[PDB]
Amino acid sequence: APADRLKALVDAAVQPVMKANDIPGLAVAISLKGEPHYFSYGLASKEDGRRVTPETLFEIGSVSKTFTATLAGYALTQDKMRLDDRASQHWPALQGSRFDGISLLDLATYTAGGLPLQFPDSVQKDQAQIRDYYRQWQPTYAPGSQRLYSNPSIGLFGYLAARSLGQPFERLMEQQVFPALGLEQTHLDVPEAALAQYAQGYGKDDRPLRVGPGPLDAEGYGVKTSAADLLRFVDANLHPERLDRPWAQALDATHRGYYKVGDMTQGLGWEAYDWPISLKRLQAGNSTPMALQPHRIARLPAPQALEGQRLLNKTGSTNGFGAYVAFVPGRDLGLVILANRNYPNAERVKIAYAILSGLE
Numbered sequence: 001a002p003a004d005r006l007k008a009l010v011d012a013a014v015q016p017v018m019k020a021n022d023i024p025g026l027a028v029a030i031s032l033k034g035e036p037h038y039f040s041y042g043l044a045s046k047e048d049g050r051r052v053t054p055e056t057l058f059e060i061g062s063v064s065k066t067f068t069a070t071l072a073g074y075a076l077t078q079d080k081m082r083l084d085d086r087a088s089q090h091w092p093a094l095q096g097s098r099f100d101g102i103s104l105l106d107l108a109t110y111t112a113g114g115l116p117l118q119f120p121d122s123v124q125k126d127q128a129q130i131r132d133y134y135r136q137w138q139p140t141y142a143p144g145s146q147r148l149y150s151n152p153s154i155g156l157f158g159y160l161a162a163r164s165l166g167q168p169f170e171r172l173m174e175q176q177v178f179p180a181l182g183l184e185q186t187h188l189d190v191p192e193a194a195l196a197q198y199a200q201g202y203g204k205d206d207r208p209l210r211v212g213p214g215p216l217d218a219e220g221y222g223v224k225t226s227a228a229d230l231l232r233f234v235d236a237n238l239h240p241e242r243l244d245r246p247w248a249q250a251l252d253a254t255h256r257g258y259y260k261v262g263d264m265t266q267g268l269g270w271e272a273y274d275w276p277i278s279l280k281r282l283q284a285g286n287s288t289p290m291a292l293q294p295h296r297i298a299r300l301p302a303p304q305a306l307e308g309q310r311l312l313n314k315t316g317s318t319n320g321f322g323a324y325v326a327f328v329p330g331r332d333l334g335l336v337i338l339a340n341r342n343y344p345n346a347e348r349v350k351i352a353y354a355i356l357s358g359l360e
């Protein structure tokens with residue numbers, strides 16, 4: 001029967017990668033022809049033997065950037081900001097800084113001029129320290145020219161989008177975005193009542209690792225969610241028209257490409273590829289040099305719709321966790337892979353590619 005064949009396909013993709021990367025627990029969720037399918041493996045906690053289920057909460061790391069982008073899409077639909085705004089329009093503390101000459105689009109798409117991968121260790125999670133970091137920052141190169149993947153960059157984008165809406169980022173996400181998307185198992189700050197679902201993360205010698213506080217952590221990498229809720233978010237991205245109109249438009253804003261770097265087209269949060277494309281090229285787009293090195297961009301003459309024969313994806317990691325999400329708009333196919341070890345992106349993509357190729 002189809003259930004036997006689908007289980008065989010997903011197990012064949014997952015099981016060797018879990019063994020090879022010593023992953024304690026992993027949850028898969030697939031959306032196929034409008035129907036969800038879940039496959040849960042291993043342990044959420046090795047110490048107490050709690051099993052992974054589709055309700056287990058995992059840290060999704062930088063997949064959070066697609067939620068940040070969705071909030072910004074809502075601010076855009078409301079006309080509270082524009083992507084061409086100067087960043088300092090939305091925060092008087094930045095008036096007269098170099099953010100007078102940097103757009104919100106540049107921040108969102110990592111092209112502001114060399115904002116680093118992470119805030120320096122010297123900037124703690126403190127409003128004044130964050131403010132002062134941005135006030136003094138100077139670009140290494142012209143804005144809009146080079147992509148350097150960056151938490152302070154899209155972090156500031158989310159922070160400013162929240163200011164355009166007159167409310168803190170975390171509050172907007174909890175009170176407005178997650179409810180509008182129908183997400184009740186998605187958190188920036190896990191409730192005490194949901195802690196039993198929060199998987200343990202694992203590092204070297206199985207050191208336990210759950211993400212700690214950092215500057216603009218919520219905007220950059222702070223979401224915890226289940227495979228079932230993250231698949232609900234993928235299904236909202238596959239069918240924005242099913243949501244109330246302002247939220248449909250907010251999702252659509254995350255499906256617009258601005259430039260290319262190699263095979264990858266950069267949207268707000270989402271990164272897109274032509275589909276089909278080889279596994280090696282999809283792995284190279286999600287490689288360590290893409291996360292760590294600047295790359296000159298090839299700007300598109302007009303923003304491009306990220307739909308049809310394309311794969312939209314995002315990797316996300318924390319010290320203890322490794323996530324990957326991908327979907328194919330023109331095929332109504334979605335996939336989520338959440339694990340409680342930060343294992344290589346190439347390996348995440350390997351599982352995903354086997355599944356997506358076999359669903360096709």
Ligand SMILES: *[B@@]1([O])O[C]([C]C([O])=O)C2=C1[C]=C(OC1=NC([N])=NS1)C([C])=C2[C]
Nearest residue numbers: 061062063214221291315316317318319
């Ligand atoms: B984010 O998860 O995207 C990458 C990793 C990947 O999977 O592509 C990334 C993200 C965040 C991040 O900074 C972090 N700081 C903390 N405290 N947790 S994650 C870094 C360094 C990278 C590479």
